[PDB]
Design a protein around this ligand. Sequence first.
Ligand SMILES: C=CC1=C(C)[C@@H](Cc2[nH]c(/C=C3N=C(/C=C4\NC(=O)[C@H](C)[C@H]4CC)C(C)=C\3CCC(=O)O)c(CCC(=O)O)c2C)NC1=O
Ligand SMILES: CCC1=C(C)/C(=C/C2=NC(=C\c3[nH]c(/C=C4\NC(=O)[C@H](C)[C@H]4CC)c(C)c3CCC(=O)O)/C(CCC(=O)O)=C2C)NC1=O
Ligand SMILES: CCC1=C(C)/C(=C/C2=NC(=C\c3[nH]c(/C=C4\NC(=O)[C@H](C)[C@H]4CC)c(C)c3CCC(=O)O)/C(CCC(=O)O)=C2C)NC1=O
Ligand SMILES: CCC1=C(C)/C(=C/C2=NC(=C\c3[nH]c(/C=C4\NC(=O)[C@H](C)[C@H]4CC)c(C)c3CCC(=O)O)/C(CCC(=O)O)=C2C)NC1=O
Ligand SMILES: CCC1=C(C)/C(=C/C2=NC(=C\c3[nH]c(/C=C4\NC(=O)[C@H](C)[C@H]4CC)c(C)c3CCC(=O)O)/C(CCC(=O)O)=C2C)NC1=O
Ligand SMILES: CCC1=C(C)/C(=C/C2=NC(=C\c3[nH]c(/C=C4\NC(=O)[C@H](C)[C@H]4CC)c(C)c3CCC(=O)O)/C(CCC(=O)O)=C2C)NC1=O
Ligand SMILES: CCC1=C(C)/C(=C/C2=NC(=C\c3[nH]c(/C=C4\NC(=O)[C@H](C)[C@H]4CC)c(C)c3CCC(=O)O)/C(CCC(=O)O)=C2C)NC1=O
Lengths: 161, 161, 161, 161, 161, 146, 47, 259, 51, 160, 160
Amino acid sequence: MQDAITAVINTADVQGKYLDDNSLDKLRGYFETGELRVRAAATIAANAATIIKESVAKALLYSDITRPGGNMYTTRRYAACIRDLDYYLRYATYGMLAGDPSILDERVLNGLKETYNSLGVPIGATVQAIQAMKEVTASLVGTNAGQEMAVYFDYICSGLS
Amino acid sequence: MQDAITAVINTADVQGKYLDDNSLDKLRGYFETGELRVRAAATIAANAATIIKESVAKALLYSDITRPGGNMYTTRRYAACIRDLDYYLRYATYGMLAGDPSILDERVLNGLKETYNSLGVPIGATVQAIQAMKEVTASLVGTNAGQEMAVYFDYICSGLS
Amino acid sequence: MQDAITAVINTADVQGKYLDDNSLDKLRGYFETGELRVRAAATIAANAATIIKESVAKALLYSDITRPGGNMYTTRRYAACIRDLDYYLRYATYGMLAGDPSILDERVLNGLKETYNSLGVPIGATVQAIQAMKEVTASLVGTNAGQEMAVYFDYICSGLS
Amino acid sequence: MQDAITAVINTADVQGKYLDDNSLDKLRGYFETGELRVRAAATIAANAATIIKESVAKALLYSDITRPGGNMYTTRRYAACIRDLDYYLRYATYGMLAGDPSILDERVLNGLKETYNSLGVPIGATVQAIQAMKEVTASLVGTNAGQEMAVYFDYICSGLS
Amino acid sequence: MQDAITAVINTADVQGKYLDDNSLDKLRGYFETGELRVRAAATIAANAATIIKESVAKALLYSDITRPGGNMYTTRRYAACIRDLDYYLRYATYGMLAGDPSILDERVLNGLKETYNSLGVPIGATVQAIQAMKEVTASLVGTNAGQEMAVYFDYICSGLS
Amino acid sequence: RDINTFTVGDEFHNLEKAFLLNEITVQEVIEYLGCSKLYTKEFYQPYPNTKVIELGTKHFLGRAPSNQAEIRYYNQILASQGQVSFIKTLVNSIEYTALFGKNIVPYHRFPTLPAANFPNTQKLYNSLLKQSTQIIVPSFGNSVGN
Amino acid sequence: SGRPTCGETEGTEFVSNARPILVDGVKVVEYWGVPNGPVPRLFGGPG
Amino acid sequence: GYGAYSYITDKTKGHVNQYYVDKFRIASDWTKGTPKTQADAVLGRTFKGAVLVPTEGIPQEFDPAIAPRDNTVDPDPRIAESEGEVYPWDINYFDPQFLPSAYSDVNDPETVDSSFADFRSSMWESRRESLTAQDFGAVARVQRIKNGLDEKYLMTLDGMLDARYARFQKIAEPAVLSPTGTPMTEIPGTPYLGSVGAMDFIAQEEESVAFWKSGPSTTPVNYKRPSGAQTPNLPYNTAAPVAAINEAQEAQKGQMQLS
Amino acid sequence: DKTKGHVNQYYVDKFRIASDWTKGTPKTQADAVLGRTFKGAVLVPTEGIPQ
Amino acid sequence: SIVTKSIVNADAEARYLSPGELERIKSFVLSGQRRLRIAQTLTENREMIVKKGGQQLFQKRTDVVSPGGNAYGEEMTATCLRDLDYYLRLVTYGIVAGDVTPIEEIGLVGVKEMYNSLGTPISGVSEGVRCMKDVACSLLSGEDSAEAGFYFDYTLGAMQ
Amino acid sequence: SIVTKSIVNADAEARYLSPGELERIKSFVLSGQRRLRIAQTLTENREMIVKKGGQQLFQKRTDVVSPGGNAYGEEMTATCLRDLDYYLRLVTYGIVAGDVTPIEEIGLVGVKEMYNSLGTPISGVSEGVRCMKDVACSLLSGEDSAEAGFYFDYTLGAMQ
Ligand SMILES: C=CC1=C(C)[C@@H](Cc2[nH]c(/C=C3N=C(/C=C4\NC(=O)[C@H](C)[C@H]4CC)C(C)=C\3CCC(=O)O)c(CCC(=O)O)c2C)NC1=O
Ligand SMILES: CCC1=C(C)/C(=C/C2=NC(=C\c3[nH]c(/C=C4\NC(=O)[C@H](C)[C@H]4CC)c(C)c3CCC(=O)O)/C(CCC(=O)O)=C2C)NC1=O
Ligand SMILES: CCC1=C(C)/C(=C/C2=NC(=C\c3[nH]c(/C=C4\NC(=O)[C@H](C)[C@H]4CC)c(C)c3CCC(=O)O)/C(CCC(=O)O)=C2C)NC1=O
Ligand SMILES: CCC1=C(C)/C(=C/C2=NC(=C\c3[nH]c(/C=C4\NC(=O)[C@H](C)[C@H]4CC)c(C)c3CCC(=O)O)/C(CCC(=O)O)=C2C)NC1=O
Ligand SMILES: CCC1=C(C)/C(=C/C2=NC(=C\c3[nH]c(/C=C4\NC(=O)[C@H](C)[C@H]4CC)c(C)c3CCC(=O)O)/C(CCC(=O)O)=C2C)NC1=O
Ligand SMILES: CCC1=C(C)/C(=C/C2=NC(=C\c3[nH]c(/C=C4\NC(=O)[C@H](C)[C@H]4CC)c(C)c3CCC(=O)O)/C(CCC(=O)O)=C2C)NC1=O
Ligand SMILES: CCC1=C(C)/C(=C/C2=NC(=C\c3[nH]c(/C=C4\NC(=O)[C@H](C)[C@H]4CC)c(C)c3CCC(=O)O)/C(CCC(=O)O)=C2C)NC1=O
């Protein structure tokens, strides 16, 4: 993976140059937004369970999916579903706090579309669940940090779709 | 896997309904054929060694395969084919006695065509060997139970081909 | 495609060199075997019909294939099979007379295994038919030229298998 | 495809809303940069030949590729190579002048990596050729428009790599 | 794998033949050349480090790979590079001392072109490095054994290209 | 591969002293190698949890994942705790003790009996390091029933 | 008692009421290799 | 196309379907929901229930001597309350915890000094451990290379470059196979011998973990001790093994320490 | 990957000796001789005390 | 099912079905009609079991229906009775299967993770199923409610 | 980067970032401008550090300078100072990263195998980096050169 800092050292390194004023402006940008990211990751760390509960309650419950015939009908599949949501929340927090979505490229979105199209997981409903996590999470962390979290949830949704 | 009973509970479950008279007719059908399946499985358990010996003697010996350069030419490869035949007979008995070929989907025909096309096992000769086991087995268990074992041997042969 | 001459000009060309004594030895080898290839191609052109009849009569007739349910059961499928044999013999002659099996890579073995595994043509029986054409053809053209045609027929059989 | 305008109408449309001040700010941004995009496309249209000639002269000539055994050694392959550099320049101009690289997703980068890895085209050299077009083209159109062309040539290079 | 002996036993075995005069001539050939292959492998074993150092100094020296952005630019990639030259030298010695390049087919050239085209390793520079090992190695072991090592280094070079 | 190109220097030098004195069994070496930061950086970092299952069984047992229920089992183990539990379950399994016991380094094997084990290990060991990011065994097919 | 995935305090390394027989039943058995599990041979018994 | 179906885009519950969620087709049943945004609204209305007002009027003209209006002043307090946003229940409410004023500002010097000093703690733990681990490892591999390199290790590439490591760094000379291949012997009887004198006995600083202690405080004086039991059994009338005589002389070595 | 590895050209190489300089000159400030500018001049910090 | 279990157990040892195992399948397939009647009775009396069991649940356990409770309201109580209906249906599946495999794979594998994800106390679930066990044993014979009641006992042992 | 040294950590533990770890991230992002002052000073004074550190290197270690040494010759001597420039640049990356990951992965992973494959004594490399540490500590403050000097100390511990 890489954060914003590593990305700056990648560009400056791969040019062979040292750190010029542009790269220092990018690191100043990240170091200004750092505290906000920290407290956002603190809040999400606090209320993960309630994010997944409220987002499943908004997006998936009392529908064809949890009715019989639906993908989430058995208790095994319900638990696997909310497990999957937890991964999306956790790695979206890592992606927020790194400031670079390369983590989502390496450890989440790789082979996931082939996996869900293998098993039979509906992609539509997954995306709507992730967007429900985006609205609930933005409600917890506020406007600015909700924009940051939203970008990474939208990154995963753009990955599966 | 699943037997015929589990399959009935799958359809009745996935509709959300309970057990209606059609599903009870299917359970009555299985419970009528039960003892026939049991004694057939008993007899095949008894004469598996004999069945393998007669089907290899009919289908494979004194040909190009056991002549040098054929695929059965060595003792390791003779053993491998003989061992392979035993698996077909055993899992065909499981499929017979469950009343549902899902076992052959899970544990036998998965990746088997990629295996034999990877190694260089002739599929033709294998299918002929399995049909030889079908005729001998039907000769041992009789008409009815030979039809039942016939559908599972034909299921494996339809899987390889 | 390419013949042996074009292959020599390929290696000499791709080194950037001109023609050294090794490549001229290869051209002398081809030009020594030239007339042998010519009369072999003449004889095979003469007796294609009889090669096919004899090889189908040895390899395929009076078996499960021409009995109903086999792949050669209908007239349409009988004619398609003899047709296929005619193509193998013709392109094997082209491969013989070029001295380089690149033709069989380009125009015969490309997609042929996907074709026969798509339709349900038995590969085993086809290989046995091609080897029957190899023996009959070698019997017509003699020892040397039968070794040469042997290479091309074995090349197609190695391609299917 | 889509331009920046179509993308704005996609977001505003898919929210169901009309055009708010943010979307009008984005269209004002594009309509400010419009004239610069026009004259840049005019200059590239004027000097396409010389872009491809100077970029091939920088990036590919007098190397292993145009020497024997290298990818561009035969004339057929030389002409196909410069033909492809013409596509990269043309569609990079379309992508610049649309303000949205969706064209490069639809008509260029789709299946191209599978095509070049099929044929034997080295991806490394291709990317270096495209970056040579980026430096020459930026030299023709100037600083700002060279940054715009820079993002689209880098988009294609990120696509192949 | 197999040596020359095992290959003779393979062809004679797979025809079902015994060992005739031809195969005994091949085993005579190998047993004549055996001691020369032994002392060559002894000397390569002695001077491996200096072969890799002199071949990197010939082939990768005074090149852009060393400069920032080249593929050898870091310490990790330099060490991986000289590590791969160690593999080429060592398996080339095994192939020489077996008298049969089947080792190179099994354990080196399998998947290597897909690996280097995946990573971004330049194939041309690799081939030139191997040829530098061919020249230095032939200088150490002399004329005869340099011809033997020359066929196996040329086998690896033909494998990558 | 050899440990030299992806390490700075000595790293876990203790295991070298502790293993050459024969106090540490081969299994405990394999566990403490499997649980280090170095093994995270190589195999746990750039790959998803399914690929981490597949590589982990390849390294520590010499084979591919056998059925779907092992994949769910290993996912829940990976998600619930992490790599440390996962390597401890691979090493401390019945299978690893039966095959290898205390004094045998794991080796490449060709499993025969269940499903696609032979083919899938043939897809694994014919792949070099970093030859593709694409997963060999993502999952198995849709089985009817539960 | 490990880290719980979803929900609170539950979600450990074994899913509750999962099967030991699905994982333990399916064994990987190199015939002509070290016997991992009991392996029968029909033709093993000496003539 | 201008209208494209992204799954990111389709918020409406088509895919996961509930009969109960539905569009507000009839006036009856507003009961079940209210609009949340300005775009979702009645034609003449607002998100709240009110008539839309264009909010543009003629500003009272002022004298040119009067100072002009300023754009960045705090909005009048009465204005905020009339929109209603001051009440927590209102949707648009802004929490006081989410203000940018609630942060430590990065530009301030005392936070940078105090917080760098907060930074240094959690790092001197791990940084200390990593450095010390490098030193222990250094001693370890130097002693490993000094003890000798076996044939099988010297064939491996790592051994070859560890033999070179010892050569370039003057730690020891390591016996390596001769350019011919036959192992470098000093005496032709046994393979892999080396010259032994006067450099084996000089201690190197890279072997010692402890650089700090440099002074041995005694003088050692040697004598012969009778050695009692531990005297090894020797065969009579024959040539004893070399090891046995070495054990006999190792048993009979006494040490006095004079401070 | 600006350095030419994939395209193997011997003539284009890095400057290693005093004689090389005739063939090429530096174009950017980052590519610079220690103590020089990108043009041939001594570096000056350009910071002084304003009157 | 017993067929599936015998097959799976046999498969693990890579051997043909044992005579003892085979004998059980005979006893199973001959005990069929008696079981069909048992699931026929619990099928056609489901409304009294779910309602009466729900009444004894909420009367024993007023905490769930207390304000701020998971079961609070009409909708939530209806969802609670919905789940008791599910486990009654699964018990009938387990009765005709002659084993808990159908019940365990539909209903029990990963149940604690789901109800912990819903905020539901699972001890209340087990008390609900125990109430339906008492009603369903009031609807059956001696040996019959022994058997069916033991399937209920297995679901109670899975919840606790 | 310091931020990475946490996401990988709780990623392998499969949990959210720990509270203790979170405090460090805050302390890191508030200590940023001091770090950028340090790497600014080592950036704009690189020529003095490379030249003067090379002088103290060659004056302490006359082995390499002498004929037959690894660094002897005009082209060779220049490269030696080129490598000191590499490490100096890396030290600056490690300062703004707040971690030696940049230094380790760009410079230290597999360094012994490379310089042993070049015939370079790596102890002379460590003496050179120590010389640049002395010059760079002469160009900074007390606590400042404690910090930066300790990054140099990490590189010395990796070379030895
Ligand atoms: C196997 C046989 C065997 C022996 C015979 C002894 C012999 C012996 N005695 C001493 C050592 C000693 N022996 C004595 C004994 C003496 N005190 C006196 O007043 C008398 C002169 C004398 C007894 C008659 C003393 C006092 C020391 C200690 C001397 C000292 O430290 O100053 C030592 C040195 C080690 C030590 O301090 O113990 C040895 C080797 N040890 C052996 O292993
Ligand atoms: C972080 C790395 C990573 C991810 C993300 C991941 C996903 C993943 N989801 C899976 C299954 C599943 N995933 C779901 C998910 C859903 N069902 C729904 O209705 C919802 C709409 C949706 C979730 C939002 C379900 C029900 C299954 C189980 C399918 C089955 O095996 O029965 C499986 C198969 C293993 C198993 O759980 O039994 C994997 C491997 N695996 C990984 O290693
Ligand atoms: C369903 C469509 C269909 C048809 C019709 C068919 C015919 C067919 N006829 C055959 C032979 C034959 N058919 C005949 C027929 C005749 N001889 C005469 O003189 C008469 C004119 C005529 C009988 C009325 C003979 C003699 C042979 C064998 C010739 C030989 O083998 O030498 C064979 C050769 C092998 C085999 O029979 O198994 C086939 C496949 N196959 C098909 O799939
Ligand atoms: C085997 C088939 C084949 C041919 C023929 C071939 C030609 C070829 N000619 C080239 C250049 C050239 N060729 C010429 C040729 C000429 N100038 C004149 O005025 C004359 C009319 C003519 C010589 C008779 C010149 C001047 C250049 C270089 C032009 C430049 O770079 O500006 C290049 C550019 C890079 C390079 O040479 O490495 C190729 C690839 N390549 C091939 O693969
Ligand atoms: C960014 C991380 C990084 C580093 C550090 C690096 C070093 C590096 N040092 C090299 C050579 C070298 N480096 C030295 C260094 C020294 N000689 C001495 O005696 C002194 C102890 C020391 C200078 C302080 C010498 C002499 C050579 C060339 C040796 C030769 O070619 O014979 C080379 C060979 C080819 C080339 O330079 O282009 C590389 C790649 N590469 C990297 O990617
Ligand atoms: C014998 C069987 C065998 C071979 C041959 C082999 C090659 C091989 N080379 C690799 C990487 C590499 N290979 C090189 C090679 C080179 N760089 C250069 O500039 C040179 C021109 C060139 C060598 C002559 C480099 C730099 C990498 C590292 C790429 C990276 O991971 O960063 C890797 C990826 C694993 C790693 O090293 O990190 C493999 C697997 N693997 C095998 O199992
Ligand atoms: C076939 C196996 C199976 C079961 C059992 C199952 C249960 C299940 N119970 C649910 C909710 C629920 N279940 C309960 C149950 C109870 N509340 C209490 O206090 C009591 C202890 C208990 C009733 C006896 C409640 C209150 C909810 C909804 C809680 C909420 O949404 O806030 C949901 C959420 C969405 C939906 O129902 O459609 C599922 C999927 N799903 C399955 O596939």
